Design a protein around this ligand. Structure first.
Ligand SMILES: Nc1ncnc2c1ncn2[C@@H]1O[C@H](COP(=O)(O)OP(=O)(O)NP(=O)(O)O)[C@@H](O)[C@H]1O
Ligand SMILES: Nc1ncnc2c1ncn2[C@@H]1O[C@H](COP(=O)(O)OP(=O)(O)NP(=O)(O)O)[C@@H](O)[C@H]1O
Ligand SMILES: Nc1ncnc2c1ncn2[C@@H]1O[C@H](COP(=O)(O)OP(=O)(O)NP(=O)(O)O)[C@@H](O)[C@H]1O
Ligand SMILES: [Mg+2]
Ligand SMILES: [Mg+2]
Ligand SMILES: [Mg+2]
Lengths: 509, 509, 509
């Protein structure tokens, strides 16, 4: 009871399971790579080139495969881009590993050399990484442009990269990190892809609470309330008792006087637009509309935190302590009807720490894929602002890193040496699969790039899938954050070091 | 409808199916190899080290595997020994092939280099094969001794090899081939393995037709009859009519006078032992016994052909034309009770062209495996008598053949060159798996043997699984017929060249 | 009841079914094409590059597909080679046809232009076919060599083509056709592919009827008997009656005297080897062996007709009329044990009209594919002897025929003109798919070959899959019988003209 694979069977069972889900994303890799169509049990379809979203949203049951998906799952988590490359490298480390295991090289020697090599790979990547200033907009734009390409050249429009760089640059909390959650991504239809705009504001999925209120306010002062604009019932249970018929109107007029007071306290701060997180009582909607104050009820807790950071307001839980300095400032607050639905556009803000990317396109599935292309572009721009180190793309720093590990291996005595050469040769899978998907001769090209790296220059030389020939990738404008490669290598090395240590499997049910 | 594997899937489906049944026999290879126990649906068990009998008598259903079994199945057919080596080489050619297919090397280029290399391998084996005289008994005994070992050192007893060489030497039809079917293998119990004897005669599974007949005849003259010693009924339908009561005894006495005549015609030739293929009439058994002539009825057609070639008789279909010169001559014809059953031992013949190997042992499954070790020993001795060329064993001519193919590959321009190096490296699987099964370090040993082959000497240097260190295999006495290696390589090369050409599979039901 | 497809659905149902089995063989086409592995319900596997054997032995159920298989099935029937090209052309005529049907071109107009174009294609092929002498052995050898290639360059060995040409040249019945059934193809194991020999004789699957008979006869005179060498029982029912006891021996001795007479009548002709179609009586086997006459009983009726044409004998049904001039003459008749089984080799004949091709190889599936390569080579050599006209290969006469039909289309007014241009463009599928399977750029190459055909030269210019560039195919030695192309085009044109006329389908069950 119940199923057990022994030694050479358990090792080949896993290595194969890893190689086989690594081959599932191989064809997506590069600008000349292809998309996959995934359907589930409900008939819901999603078409994408994003490696991790393919692996995450497909039913994988083999335990060794589930564990190599973790590599892509934590690559989007730490970087944003490079999910397909991390898995493909992990796959080719497994292939190159069984060639040693079939030559009787003990798994502990393989894993020893694999780790000695991934250590060297990290400290070799630090020396070959160009140093770049966190505000070099022309270089950040190339980094954003190289990320959108790879999902395809047609998605990579110039004006979209400039928009992305300007949005990531805005949400930087001095000093000095980039929060990916601060850039709100909204997906609406329209005849677009080119109509995707950067909104320096927030988009709230709510309408004006009363129709009598204005629908367009310019240079508006915005107040944010966590308090409920209703009657304040006491915590210790309370009940009123009326014995005089003339006391009826007393309590009602006193209660509705508490609502007149609250609306008059909001006008005292000078605020003409109001976003309440809790509910607003019906009488108070009438008094607000009479004052000319645009208000919205039951706004999401997450949208209140967006508005607060974007306009420059404060979330106040006590309407009595609403000061005039706790109001935010936005150049336009308007209720538009975009794509059928009506929403409140709070835009044109002065100094935003939160920003909305309105991603638009013709069909919902087109929109959803451009959205995934921006999540990747935001990830790499954020990584260059934090790290300040970039490397050349097009499989260029893999060839350079490959040849430097091979001459590092010559200086290693022992059979661990074979595992370091194996590791080096595995890295060359990125330049090779860029060529396969391009249509070009992978074997031939890999030799021209390898020979154009020997001695001194170039280091920045790699395959250009559009030109066909081997070009200088730095002068071309093909660049990635250092974190894309160091993470992809480390996570591929650590997960395959673990699978290789397995010699027995025990599967139930 | 119904199941189809495309391109990279179909190629990996087959290659894997071939590698996996090649790994099923890997552990049997060598003197330090292990046996397999095979059970079927009926509960009938057979334990063996013979590669082909393992592959033949196990339920293999994968079409690509069925086709690599053909390699073992036609190795026993053409050589007798080397069935495991042929499959293991074919397996390692498949492994080394997907390493090229995963680097995008077109299958047509792989198969081109594989064939160019197997051509060279054949004409390189001709030069390194020592020339040996078809009757060099001390060398033929070494060739028989090297074959029995490998099924295990304990089976390889000195006196058994000498017996086998003397039996194969006897059945050689001048000029000048060896028929494996002329050496009759019989399996009887007893407390043995050491009681296996060479019988210069035939063992007939019959008894004396009448108990009154002698049970031991020395220097007997043997007559062989294809004719039935009964009354000859005419082909055109005949019937007798009796009208006189005195005519009853006439026909009966006349009919039994035809049987007296037939027995008197056999005694006229001088024959005192008689083997009839058809039936012998009851009256004629009595007259034969009265003359002292030992006879046996309904002897198998195959046993008549054995007796004819062994004693030097002629199979006569007409009892009237039984000359005195058509009798065979054997030194002892006796009815013994060996292992419970009683049989006629026709032994001690002068000049036999047929011979019986009485293989004996304690249990039926022990006997059956010693029988398989003799079928192999008879195969290789027969191959040395026909070919007259031998090579050194212990993975010695694989290392030599490997290093010569590698320097032949340097003289090849093109990507076919990678397939020739692959082919060379595949051959080193025999020295390597000899070391695995021995317990020794396969990687280390393979280097000492490879380095002891460079320059001039030795060529005859290989791994000695008993010594541990690399020894000169020719001086040790470890030698195989050239045909064991040239066949194993050619059949491994032709079958894997065919699987590699497959890119689509269509499996029904 | 039950399933009916209307108009545009029925037309697309069929065209698709035809395009889809045409794509099933597309990858086999050319020397750089790949093999298929076919498995059935019983687990029996066959691996082949032969187009028709793929289509024949796979379960195809779609009626429109079954009808396009007829095209390959009658291409082997009339030519032997070109089965894949005929189907692939038929497929591309269907593809090019729906492009017209989707532009509203009536099916009757399509089929009109298709037929006007296939007429022109036939009379254009007559002018571009080189005239070749039926005994130009160097040209016949190139034709045999071009046929074996395409199933793969590795099968195409020089010495095998010379053997094939010599065998087809031998069986020519003056004047002056070639019967494919006169060249007997036999498949036996061995370590071969190179051990395939031409036997100027017949190989009979029988043994010597008596072991006492010789096993090797040189310059033997062979008698062939359709008569049974037994006692002749009368047709009108007969029965013998014996009343005298001395009459018993009378009839037996008289009956066996009829057998002594028959054997003495065969020795009278001077024949020392005998092949009987019926049975031979046991007494008569003894008398034959005593005379030294090698005989074989119950020889197949088909093998008797082989021997008769090969040795130069006559099949005699009356043993009394066996003249001395009715004996055949063969240089060697021997009973060998080839591949385990023992057979009678009747070889080295003087003037054979029947010939045996002993096709040998290492595994049964390797043998069976080389056998299919020879059936194709025999087909094309036979077509060149009969026709005396050949064309250039490598998709060369398709490009030339394509460009000549396109300028013939300009001289056609009406919408039928669109179907003639469609037909011309469909022919370019052979040069294009030769390039796809080679790996080369199909679009680019097709332009270099098309441009190297314009004006005068070359006409014999086409793609060389080994060189890569466009070469002169006549000087290279790449040539096909005219019948391969004219048959492939006619059968593709007639079957797709019929499918295109279908507008309604009625499928039951
Ligand atoms: N114009 C270009 N020329 C050559 N290589 C390029 C170009 N643009 C991008 N690349 C390279 O292509 C790879 C990116 O391919 P892509 O298919 O997007 O996969 P990924 O980024 O690894 N994963 P993911 O985008 O998360 O699905 C990187 O190695 C880039 O350096
Ligand atoms: N004393 C020895 N030392 C080293 N190698 C040996 C020795 N005896 C035999 N061999 C080698 O061991 C191999 C034979 O091993 P074995 O396990 O019998 O398989 P096989 O002969 O390939 N097939 P089979 O015997 O038909 O099951 C050959 O390559 C021999 O040359
Ligand atoms: N050396 C060569 N160079 C270029 N073309 C060649 C060469 N040899 C053969 N051909 C062409 O390749 C085609 C034959 O390919 P092949 O794959 O054998 O299919 P087929 O002959 O159409 N059918 P079949 O052989 O019956 O399976 C013909 O059009 C040949 O003229
Ligand atoms: Mg990307
Ligand atoms: Mg052996
Ligand atoms: Mg052909």
């Amino acid at each position: 009871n119940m199923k057990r694979y022994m030694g050479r069977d358990a090792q080949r069972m896993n290595i194969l399971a890893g190689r086989i889900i690594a081959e599932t994303v191989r064809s997506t890799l590069g600008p000349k790579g292809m998309d996959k169509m995934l359907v589930d049990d409900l008939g819901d379809v999603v078409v994408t080139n994003d490696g991790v979203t393919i692996l995450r949203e497909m039913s994988v049951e083999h335990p060794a495969a589930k564990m190599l998906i973790e590599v892509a799952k934590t690559q989007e988590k730490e970087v944003g881009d490079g999910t397909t490359t991390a898995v493909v490298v992990a796959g080719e480390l497994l292939r190159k590993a069984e060639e040693l295991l079939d030559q009787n090289v003990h798994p502990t020697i393989v894993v020893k050399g694999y780790q000695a090599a991934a250590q060297k790979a990290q400290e070799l990547l630090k020396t070959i990484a160009c140093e770049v200033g966190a505000q070099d907009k022309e270089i950040l734009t190339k980094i954003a442009m190289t990320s959108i390409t790879g999902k395809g050249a047609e998605k990579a429009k110039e004006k979209l990269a400039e928009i992305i760089v300007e949005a990531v640059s805005a949400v930087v909390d001095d000093e000095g990190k980039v929060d990916k959650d601060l850039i709100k991504i909204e997906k609406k239809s329209g005849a677009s892809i080119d109509d995707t705009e950067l909104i320096k504001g927030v988009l709230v999925d709510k309408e004006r609470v009363s129709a009598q209120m204005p629908k367009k306010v310019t240079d508006a002062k915005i107040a944010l309330l966590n308090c409920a604009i209703e009657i304040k019932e006491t915590e210790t249970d309370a009940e009123i008792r009326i014995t005089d018929p003339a006391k009826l109107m007393e309590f009602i007029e006193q209660e509705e006087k508490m609502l007149k007071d609250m609306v008059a306290e909001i006008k005292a701060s000078g605020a003409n637009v109001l976003f309440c997180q809790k509910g607003i009582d019906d009488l108070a909607q009438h008094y607000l509309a009479k004052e000319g104050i645009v208000a919205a009820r039951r706004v999401k807790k997450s949208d209140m935190e967006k508005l607060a950071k974007a306009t420059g307001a404060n979330v106040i839980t006590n309407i009595k302590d609403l000061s005039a300095q706790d109001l935010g400032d936005a150049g336009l607050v308007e209720e538009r009807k975009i794509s059928g639905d009506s929403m409140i556009f709070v835009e044109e803000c002065k100094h935003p720490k939160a920003v909305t990317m309105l991603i638009r396109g013709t069909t919902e599935h087109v929109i959803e894929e451009v959205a995934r292309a921006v999540d990747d572009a935001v990830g790499v721009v954020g990584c260059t602002i934090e790290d300040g180190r970039i490397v050349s793309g097009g499989g260029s720093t893999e060839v350079e890193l490959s040849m430097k590990l091979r001459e590092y291996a010559e200086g290693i005595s022992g059979r661990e040496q074979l595992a370091v050469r194996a590791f080096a040769d595995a890295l060359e899978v990125i330049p090779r699969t860029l060529a396969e998907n391009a249509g070009l001769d992978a074997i031939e090209i890999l030799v021209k790039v390898r020979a154009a790296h020997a001695s001194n220059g170039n280091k920045c030389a790699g395959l250009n899938v559009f030109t066909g020939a081997v070009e200088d990738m730095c002068e071309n404008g093909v660049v990635e954050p250092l974190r894309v490669k160091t993470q992809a290598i480390q996570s591929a090395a650590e997960s395959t070091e673990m699978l290789l240590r397995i010699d027995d499997v025990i599967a139930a049910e």
